[PDB]
Amino acid sequence: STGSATTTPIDSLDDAYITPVQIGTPAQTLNLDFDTGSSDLWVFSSETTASEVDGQTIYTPSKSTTAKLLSGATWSISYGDGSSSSGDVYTDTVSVGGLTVTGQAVESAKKVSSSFTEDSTIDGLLGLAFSTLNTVSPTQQKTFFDNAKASLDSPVFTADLGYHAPGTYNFGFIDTTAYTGSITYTAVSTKQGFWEWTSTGYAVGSGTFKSTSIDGIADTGTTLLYLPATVVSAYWAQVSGAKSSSSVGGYVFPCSATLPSFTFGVGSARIVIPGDYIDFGPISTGSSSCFGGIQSSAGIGINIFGDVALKAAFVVFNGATTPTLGFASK
């Protein structure tokens, strides 16, 4: 089997992407944030504290003839940005882009933190990291991909995120029309539960490539590119007036600037992030200070190849017995 679904930016900055997901019988379609950096499929629901729901579409398990309470199961998750959610668990039928999994754990939120409430466009998350990170207790549950894998034509999914435009998540096949050149594959460590890999280096603009190993995670659920302070400083030094602002919470730059590109290495291959992808607009409405899309990972404890990086590539998440990651230009 295969599936194919369009993923759409939630706003004009590509702060996140939403993908429609069918849950239950008859189908209830929710727009979920596909997140290769976590492993829980959770949704706003009829059980979510009412004051914490503001415009999201909710899953109502009592209206699904295939929903079953997973007795005794609870979940609770905290994300790198400080947001969180928790609740109980149902199993139900879940379909993405024509690909159907029966008996999928659908984690129903009883509580969500303010950031989730405040974002009316995201109805929940669909985790695509390794199932070892799944938070359901006392019986850990499998991700949608893990459940689908054996049925897929090939044990892969691909992320093709757009810049200020829709893109595609495919399951079970590689669309050879969706990228240019060849796909370069690179080793993955699953030790921390992430799609963790090592970039071979970087360049700033038309500058020379610096060969250096950068361990990090491919994370569709993180907006920006978080890299070591040395790398980030070298990038922003090429932008007149750019500075790190403790009050704003990162590098800012004059909105009048033209940003240089940023290149990262995948083996001997190179992925080029155009400068415009690194512009996240005014820090506050009407400001002429703009927020940078490349930020320091210092104090995160891990480097993160978030959407800023991934949207410059066609990315293969290869879930074979020994997982790997592939990157192609597009």
From Swiss-Prot:
- The disulfides recorded in the entry are C255-C290
Q: Where is the active site?
A: D35, S199
Single Gene Ontology MF annotation: aspartic-type endopeptidase activity
Which transformation does this protein catalyse, written as a reaction?
A: Hydrolysis of proteins with specificity similar to that of pepsin A, prefers hydrophobic residues at P1 and P1', but does not cleave 14-Ala-|-Leu-15 in the B chain of insulin or Z-Glu-Tyr. Clots milk
Ordered alphabetically, the record's keywords are:
Aspartyl protease, Disulfide bond, Hydrolase, Protease, Signal, Zymogen
Q: Which residues form the Peptidase A1 domain?
A: 17-328
| Record has Thylakoid as a keyword | no
Give an example GO biological process. Answer: proteolysis
Q: Does the keyword Disulfide bond apply?
A: yes
What EC number(s) is this enzyme filed under? 3.4.23.22
Q: Which family does it belong to?
A: Belongs to the peptidase A1 family.
Name of the protein: Endothiapepsin
* Organism name: Cryphonectria parasitica (Chestnut blight fungus)
Q: What is the lineage of its organism?
A: Eukaryota, Fungi, Dikarya, Ascomycota, Pezizomycotina
Name the encoding gene, please.
Answer: EAPA
